[PDB]
């Protein structure tokens with residue numbers, strides 16, 4: 001529903017102003033005693049007059065407060081901008097994090113809409129994965145973000161499905177290993193391995209070491225486009241397929257089919273078109289980032305088919321779903 | 329206000345989706361019989377799949393509608409996206425027009441907040457004026473938009489001030505001549521001169537010839553940083569000062585002061601802080617485009633001082649104001 005002006009509906013000043021405040025950690029500086037533009041600016045490394053102008057615009061938006069002496073304060077809503085807030089939103093808007101950086105790729109949406117190709121490269125001169133692969137710090141922030149997305153969307157994932165019955169699970173593209181770390185912590189006799197590029201896989205390793213799970217959890221550095229560790233009880237694809245177009249998606253699913261064999265299970269875990277954490281907005285982000293797409297339960301089925309797999313179940317877990325596929 | 333989440337407040341997907349729809353003229357294609365993704369896409373030269381995904385996100389926003397068969401239709405609100413619409417909004421969002429292209433400069437807002445410098449260059453490798461001066465078609469669209477801004481904001485200008493008394497007015501930075509054309513049409517004994525760069529000045533000239541005002545309206549190509557046609561009854565600066573930082577603004581005001589001498593009147597016409605069509609949004613826009621800014625009566629006055637001028641009056645007209653300055 002649009003009960004707000006067309007031009008205002010297309011405003012970029014506010015979205016960018018919020019992201020800049022999130023990047024300059026303005027809320028943190030405010031709650032830490034810096035109240036005036038002059039202060040916040042020096043504490044953040046910004047131009048005094050310019051920052052003041054950004055703040056005044058954000059006061060109008062409803063995130064800040066400004067008193068007679070130019071003393072800025074946080075609104076009830078502006079609290080969400082603090083890096084220590086419960087919702088952990090600020091890091092998603094930070095222009096330095098992978099997502100706060102990729103989202104700026106939307107400024108090239110026209111290219112995707114015309115060609116069907118990702119926009120991220122247009123603005124950054126390289127794919128998203130290539131970017132993370134050459135910037136270790138950038139890649140770490142992405143690992144942290146997906147780790148947070150797990151808490152956000154996979155709430156209760158442990159019990160919602162019968163994992164223990166798998167014995168050994170392979171988390172294909174499992175990042176820092178947050179999911180496996182959660183599955184194993186809730187299933188004493190379960191073991192598994194995280195398969196991912198070297199950055200996340202090494203982060204997964206560092207985690208299992210500290211977490212005390214190295215005895216049951218292992219990492220394997222590799223591309224899920226090549227053969228995967230074979231014969232596991234289950235292969236999980238958590239928020240992976242939507243990052244790829246149809247050709248790549250079957251490529252990935254196919255590999256899982258091979259490793260799964262006529263006795264394993266392939267579990268695609270993601271927000272299916274319909275879920276409350278799966279909107280048209282997210283679908284366009286997948287398009288602009290990697291040319292991926294959010295898919296319906298029917299569309300995943302078509303992909304499964306082309307990879308010799310068949311959906312057998314689809315349990316909704318909070319904001320997302322777990323679709324279970326087995327040998328055709 | 330904050331009636332919506334922080335991350336939603338920072339959403340770029342929708343602002344860009346609207347701007348892309350505006351650029352692809354989707355609404356016009358729909359109202360003209362093309363109501364299917366394949367049809368609209370083909371008529372606009374977009375990727376069928378990608379366009380369909382853009383439209384679905386836009387029906388969700390409330391601009392379009394779609395039936396079970398995939399037939400798209402506009403809505404009470406999506407009607408404003410058609411070019412033929414009264415409000416004339418679409419052209420402002422078009423990524424091809426000068427303002428639809430300039431606004432994308434907001435993705436570099438951070439640069440402006442940190443340095444006080446304009447963002448436009450960061451994105452386009454050259455200043456706004458430099459860009460328009462090397463691309464006549466781009467400069468033409470800008471003239472049209474400023475022309476339209478006169479209708480949107482200056483409604484009534486003709487009568488709210490005693491123009492006829494000036495005898496001869498020079499519109500410093502008068503663009504394609506709309507304002508002067510409106511003043512002289514309402515006052516048959518008044519004459520004037522539009523002073524602008526090549527592009528607008530010739531557009532003004534063409535306008536005057538066709539509308540039969542060449543007998544009273546004259547064009548003069550030149551920079552308002554250099555001397556100006558002297559001894560005029562009044563020199564107008566319509567929506568010019570907010571395009572410049574304090575130094576340049578003073579330079580410009582000086583020239584007008586000099587040309588006006590002890591007998592002319594300098595008139596600044598623009599939305600000052602407080603006036604409508606004036607907001608923190610516009611202020612940030614001025615900052616990212618040219619490092620200019622929206623100013624208050626107080627602020628213009630300090631500039632007039634630095635230019636041997638002094639505010640004598642300030643009549644509000646519609647959503648803007650006329651600040652009448654005179655020599656000290």
Ligand SMILES: Nc1ncnc2c1ncn2[C@@H]1O[C@H](CSCC[C@H](N)C(=O)O)[C@@H](O)[C@H]1O
Nearest residue numbers: 146173174175196197200222223224238239
């Ligand atoms: N070719 C490839 N081979 C293996 N992993 C890859 C890959 N390309 C990308 N990835 C990984 O795929 C993951 C997708 S995003 C994170 C998914 C994770 N299971 C979670 O839900 O948090 C990232 O860790 C990314 O590094």
Ligand SMILES: Nc1ncnc2c1ncn2[C@@H]1O[C@H](CSCC[C@H](N)C(=O)O)[C@@H](O)[C@H]1O
Nearest residue numbers: 474501502503524525528550551552566567
């Ligand atoms: N150095 C310069 N000398 C003269 N005109 C200039 C200039 N730099 C920019 N301009 C003109 O300043 C104008 C500012 S925008 C349009 C202002 C016009 N009075 C209106 O209200 O529509 C543009 O026409 C721009 O081309």
Ligand SMILES: COc1cc(C)c2ccc(O)c(C(=O)O)c2c1
Nearest residue numbers: 092099102146149239240285289
């Ligand atoms: C689900 O996996 C992903 C992957 C990417 C790239 C994302 C990018 C931006 C986001 O906001 C989210 C999100 O979940 O909120 C996101 C999630």
Ligand SMILES: COc1cc(C)c2ccc(O)c(C(=O)O)c2c1
Nearest residue numbers: 420427430474477567568613617
């Ligand atoms: C007043 O002169 C200008 C100059 C520029 C560059 C503008 C850019 C975008 C706008 O929306 C507006 C407007 O008035 O609406 C605008 C006005």
